[PDB]
């Protein structure tokens, strides 16, 4: 019914009912602009413009929670790549050595940092990024799990080394709890925008990095996934289109989105007969 109803840091409860404030960025408002006039316009929440809240721009979204009773929410993150390839020249040129990220990834993993990181107590932040890629499916699959928030108010983000197809699978098993209908509508949604990326004029003309699916269900059944997060999608420079299939190597600037979605896709249909 709310998404701010569950959180009780770039969200706010807007003033009027069915709605959310995001924090505006330049990337994300120009992206959700667009999509409202792409072939993607349903596959995202409805944008309805910019609102000052004190003297601080918000975009104003649809809550895509507003229309459920009491939802499941699981937040997927898209793409082989999680980082913009100006990360990996800003972090050559002029390092800014991330001792927050050292110690997340120590965090995680004590053996992970290099003889040279443990001594700087600090990583760059691709090479970060490239690690959380790679010790949960996002390398292999091209998503991973980011987070799950239930209908009994438990919430879960301990998925950085959920990794197998098979691990994957087990956390969307827990998500859906055996509710058929959920999976089959979750299923129909997926091919769908499957369907309507693979046409997208949007979608050809992004590198689109950083973005997740949002699956949205509850107890009555009610199912629906749209793409969120903008912030980190990026314009192709000229006529310069991507196959969002084909691998990453830094300057195709591939995402491995449709690799990614092909796989949920596969994973989803397997636990379907399952
Ligand atoms: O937050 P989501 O989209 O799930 O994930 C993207 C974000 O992931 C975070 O890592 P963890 O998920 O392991 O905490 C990074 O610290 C954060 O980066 P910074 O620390 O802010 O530089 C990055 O974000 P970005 O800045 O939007 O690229
Ligand atoms: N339009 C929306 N309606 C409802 N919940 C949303 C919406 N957008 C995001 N969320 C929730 O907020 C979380 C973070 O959203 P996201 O756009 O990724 O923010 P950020 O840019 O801070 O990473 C999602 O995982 C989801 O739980
Ligand atoms: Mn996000
Ligand atoms: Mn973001």
Redesign the pocket.
Known sequence: GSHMSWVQGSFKAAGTSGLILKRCSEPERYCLARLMADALRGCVPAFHGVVERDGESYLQLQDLLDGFDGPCVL?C?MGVR???EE?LTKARERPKL?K??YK??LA?DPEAPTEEEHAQRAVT?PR??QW?EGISSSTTLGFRI??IKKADGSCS?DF?TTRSREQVLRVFEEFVQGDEEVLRRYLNRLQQIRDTLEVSEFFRRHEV????LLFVHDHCHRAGVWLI?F??TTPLPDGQILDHRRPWEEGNREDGYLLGLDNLIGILASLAER
């Open positions: 937040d993150k999680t980082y913009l990360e991330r927050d990220m997340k990834m995680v932040k970060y990024m959380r980011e987070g983000t950085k990095i950083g973005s997740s997060d912030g980190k």
